[PDB]
UniProtKB/Swiss-Prot annotation, chain A:
Origin organism lineage: Eukaryota, Metazoa, Chordata, Craniata, Vertebrata
Record note on modification: Phosphorylated by CK2 and PKD kinases.
Protein name per the record: COP9 signalosome complex subunit 2
Function summary: Essential component of the COP9 signalosome complex (CSN), a complex involved in various cellular and developmental processes. The CSN complex is an essential regulator of the ubiquitin (Ubl) conjugation pathway by mediating the deneddylation of the cullin subunits of SCF-type E3 ligase complexes, leading to decrease the Ubl ligase activity of SCF-type complexes such as SCF, CSA or DDB2. The complex is also involved in phosphorylation of p53/TP53, c-jun/JUN, IkappaBalpha/NFKBIA, ITPK1 and IRF8/ICSBP, possibly via its association with CK2 and PKD kinases.
Cellular localization per UniProt: Cytoplasm; Nucleus
Subunit structure as annotated in this protein's UniProt entry: Component of the CSN complex, composed of COPS1/GPS1, COPS2, COPS3, COPS4, COPS5, COPS6, COPS7 (COPS7A or COPS7B), COPS8 and COPS9 isoform 1. In the complex, it probably interacts directly with COPS1, COPS4, COPS5, COPS6 and COPS7 (COPS7A or COPS7B). Specifically interacts with the ligand binding domain of the thyroid receptor (TR). Does not require the presence of thyroid hormone for its interaction. Interacts with CUL1 and CUL2. Interacts with IRF8/ICSBP1 and with nuclear receptors NR2F1 and NR0B1. Interacts with NIF3L1.
Signal peptide start and end residues: none
Residues of the full protein shown: 346 to 443 of 443
Assigned protein family: Belongs to the CSN2 family.
Lineage: superkingdom: Eukaryota
From Swiss-Prot, chain B:
Similarity section: Belongs to the CSN3 family.
Protein's gene: COPS3
Tissue: Widely expressed. Expressed at high level in heart and skeletal muscle.
Subcellular location: Cytoplasm; Nucleus
Quaternary structure and partners: Component of the CSN complex, composed of COPS1/GPS1, COPS2, COPS3, COPS4, COPS5, COPS6, COPS7 (COPS7A or COPS7B), COPS8 and COPS9 isoform 1. In the complex, it probably interacts directly with COPS1, COPS4, COPS8 and COPS9 isoform 1. Interacts with CK2 and PKD. Interacts with the translation initiation factor EIF3S6 and IKBKG. Interacts with ERCC6.
Name of the protein in question: COP9 signalosome complex subunit 3
Note: Amplified and overexpressed in some osteosarcomas (OS), suggesting that it may participate in TP53 degradation in OS.
Job description of the protein: Component of the COP9 signalosome complex (CSN), a complex involved in various cellular and developmental processes. The CSN complex is an essential regulator of the ubiquitin (Ubl) conjugation pathway by mediating the deneddylation of the cullin subunits of SCF-type E3 ligase complexes, leading to decrease the Ubl ligase activity of SCF-type complexes such as SCF, CSA or DDB2. The complex is also involved in phosphorylation of p53/TP53, c-jun/JUN, IkappaBalpha/NFKBIA, ITPK1 and IRF8/ICSBP, possibly via its association with CK2 and PKD kinases.
Taxonomic source organism: Homo sapiens (Human)
UniProtKB/Swiss-Prot annotation, chain C:
Subunit structure, as described in the record: Component of the CSN complex, composed of COPS1/GPS1, COPS2, COPS3, COPS4, COPS5, COPS6, COPS7 (COPS7A or COPS7B), COPS8 and COPS9 isoform 1. In the complex, it probably interacts directly with COPS2, COPS3, COPS4 and COPS5. Interacts directly with inositol kinase ITPK1. Interacts with CAPN8. Interacts with USP48. Interacts with ASB4; this interaction negatively regulates GPS1.
Domain notes: The PCI domain is necessary and sufficient for the interactions with other CSN subunits of the complex. Mediates the interaction with CAPN8.
Protein name as annotated: COP9 signalosome complex subunit 1
GO molecular function, one term: GTPase inhibitor activity
SUPFAM superfamilies, sorted: Winged helix' DNA-binding domain
Tissue: Widely expressed.
Biological process, per Gene Ontology: JNK cascade; protein deneddylation; protein neddylation; regulation of protein neddylation
Keyword Ligase in annotation: no
Residue stretches making up the PCI domain: 206-368
Amino acid sequence: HIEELLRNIRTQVLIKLIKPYTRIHIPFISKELNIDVADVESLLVQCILDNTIHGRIDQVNQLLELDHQKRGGARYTALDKWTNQLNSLNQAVVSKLA
Amino acid sequence: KKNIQRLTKTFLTLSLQDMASRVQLSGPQEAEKYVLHMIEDGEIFASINQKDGMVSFHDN
Amino acid sequence: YVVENPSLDLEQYAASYSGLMRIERLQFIADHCPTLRVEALKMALSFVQRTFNVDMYEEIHRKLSEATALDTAWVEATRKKALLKLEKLDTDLKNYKGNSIKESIRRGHDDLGDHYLDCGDLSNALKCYSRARDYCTSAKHVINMCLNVIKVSVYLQNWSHVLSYVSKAESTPEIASQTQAILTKLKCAAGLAELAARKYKQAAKCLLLASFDHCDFPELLSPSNVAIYGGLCALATFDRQELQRNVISSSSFKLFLELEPQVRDIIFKFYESKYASCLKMLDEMKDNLLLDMYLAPHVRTLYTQIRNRALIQYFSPYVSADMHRMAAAFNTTVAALEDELTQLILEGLISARVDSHSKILYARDVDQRSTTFEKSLLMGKEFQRRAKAMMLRAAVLRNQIHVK
């Protein structure tokens, strides 16, 4: 069961470390977690695929971009819904008889 | 023109030689002139780089 | 379906079953394995010599003769003495129904149906069992009759009727210690019917509830192929948030996965983002899988959906992926990967853009405000056009214009 350990603690450290960052370097995480680049990338991929870390990995520049964006534009989606409904009502009125 | 426009929904930078293989225009020069004509009419948003012979799609 | 030249053991595979079902599967092998014809047909003949086969026995016999005689004395034995046996059974069905004893009539119909199944006349046995239906007056009697009807209808290849009978058998005697053989039997039959009905998700959902200790039924399917079906269906139609709860952490399925290490390895490697090895072992398992009935038709689609799911899952955590590593991990060239990605993007599964100058797949972020404004403007223009159209219509429908 020691393999389950040395991974939960690393995950907790990674979550606690990348909280205030928006663009972090993967080698920095590798230095902090005392593991090589490949294991850090695998851990990040596994964490992201489990809907635990809100971020993405840029493989070209070896970067991790967090999600301190996407403000509350819920208004917009509401408008979209309205538009759809309006379109439907249109088909009801024009094609009633003539 | 429809095929060229559909190409812009998947590709961000396409070589002219590769481009004149899916739309079947048989020649990079003909593809270049078609893309230039399409740009002049505002149907597409693209730029031609003659150094590498590549078309880059902006879509902004 | 032909020219596959695979390798597969036939002794232990056929030894896991009993009755005419074995012969059926053997026939399927003879249809799909041109290299194993002689030995498979010889073993099928050896098995069928014990049974009461009449028409399909000569079928397989002349098929193997043409591929490369018959003990004609026991063929006469079959026809005349077995028709004497049929006369005896008919006679004692009349004898038993003369006293009108419900259990006696049920037993007579059951024996007649079993003999018809052994002789290949199960089509009439279905009508005999639907007749015996009227003589069932107990909960266990009904359960047994629906199990037998499902069994004989599996041989008929009518999956809708089998599913309807499974549903009515689960719903009639208020469903539910007692032996779980009946529950496992009905669940496995429903899963097979749904798999044959091009509904993989429901088959996987209703097949995962089996138990290894209660899986003792060498007449429909072995636990090995049950585990294979469950694993493949879960890997192809279950998302990541549902594969972990029911296929990974579910303790009931550990026994099945331990029985077949390879499918467990495939599932675990897919769950751990190891796609090269998973795809390689899938490719090497395809040859064996092509010889399974209730599977050979729907194999290509399953593999395609597994590969597409792997492609989406690989790119899910990335924002800019180099396609050289992507092609290396998927055991394919860059051009084939580019074509597959283009097809996926056109279909509408991955929102990404391909850059061929540096061979990089970039993620695409949609500007919500811009698309909202564009959609609203388009809807407004469409509504104005429709309004003017209808108003012209009202102008022309009021003056009585009808093209006489």
